[PDB]
Paper text:
The first step of this process is the transport of sialic acid to the cytoplasm, which often takes place using a tripartite ATP-independent transport system consisting of a periplasmic binding protein and a membrane transporter.
Pm-[name] and Fn-[name] were crystallized together with Neu5Ac. Their structures were determined to 1.57 and 2.5 Å resolution, respectively. The structure of Pm-[name] was refined to an R factor of 0.17 and a free R factor of 0.20, and that of Fn-[name] was refined to an R factor of 0.21 and a free R factor of 0.25. All three proteins (Pm-[name], Fn-[name] and Hi-[name]) have very similar structures, distinguished by two domains on either side of a well defined pocket, within which Neu5Ac binds. Similar inter­actions between these four residues and Neu5Ac exist in Hi-[name] and Pm-[name], with minor differences in sequence numbering (e.g. Arg127 and Arg147 are involved in the first two interactions in Hi-[name]), as also seen previously. There was one interaction seen in Hi-[name] (between Asn10 and O10 of Neu5Ac) that was not evident in Fn-[name] and Pm-[name]. The binding affinities of Fn-[name] and Pm-[name] to Neu5Ac are 45.5 and 19.7 nM, respectively. Thus, it was interesting that the SiaPs of F. nucleatum and [name] bound both forms of SA with equal affinity, and that there was only a moderate decrease in the binding of Neu5Gc in the case of V. cholerae.
Numbering used by the authors: 2 to 309
Amino acid sequence: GADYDLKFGMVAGPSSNEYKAVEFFAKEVKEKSNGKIDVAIFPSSQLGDDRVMIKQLKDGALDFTLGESARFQIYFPEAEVFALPYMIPNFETSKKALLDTKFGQGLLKKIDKELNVQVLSVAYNGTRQTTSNRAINSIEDMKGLKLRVPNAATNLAYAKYVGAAPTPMAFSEVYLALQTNSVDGQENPLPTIQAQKFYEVQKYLALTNHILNDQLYLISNDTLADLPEDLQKVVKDAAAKAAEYHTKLFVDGENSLVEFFKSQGVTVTQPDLKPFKAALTPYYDEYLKKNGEVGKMAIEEISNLAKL
Ligand SMILES: CC(=O)N[C@H]1[C@H]([C@H](O)[C@H](O)CO)O[C@](O)(C(=O)O)C[C@@H]1O
């Protein structure tokens, strides 16, 4: 078969838009390399979660993974800006904030230099909404709600600041937790709610619109070093096409999925978001205290972009 047998790990499962785009990536790479590269895919946290996988890219033990810009906060806390709730208004602002600002370029350089990882392309992974086993009519209904979050500082802070009881748990554990009422809710973009069938086990959806997720196609520098230049170019080009498809999948899913969910019996609320935004405002201050002048710059540059 192939000269290069590469591995691509992800948290998302095999019915997800992420998996659809990663399968497209693997196909494009096999075709354009003339069969010289073959890509195996390990979804559903088969290799661990995304923190483990990012570490495996760093260590040269895994070739590819997906990760949010914001996830880099586990190494470079200033990256948290990408996840601060209600701070980034759309994908265009997120992508330009990473690629076209001095802050973002500085962060990409650190990732390459210190973590041994290159960003191949940037995709949209949806805006997070809140499912539950009780109606969320306003921020008041968050109070004491047992809200699963991923194992991520910003989602923990979101739950805390709205009044909820944050319960961190790996993605792979969520469906059972919802089904059994071990937690009262969780929070994820619409397409994820569909792919994991969380709508099967949650009677309610609230459009809290709280955190916008991007999605980085990541490659280990050890992988790039293992590939000849012309196959490096194949990989880079394929990642560019896959990200565009990935983003389209999420945009078209978001535009359609509330109606789908209603048709499956889900009750869909639209709480006033003004008090959600006000509740999180002070967490921006925590960010600024933790990250100093780099943090300040990040927020100014995003503000300027959002203004366009
Ligand atoms: C690239 C990646 O693995 N994204 C995953 C994210 C991030 O881990 C989290 O947003 C913190 O960055 O968590 C999920 O939304 C979740 O567990 O609910 C699953 C999703 O597949």
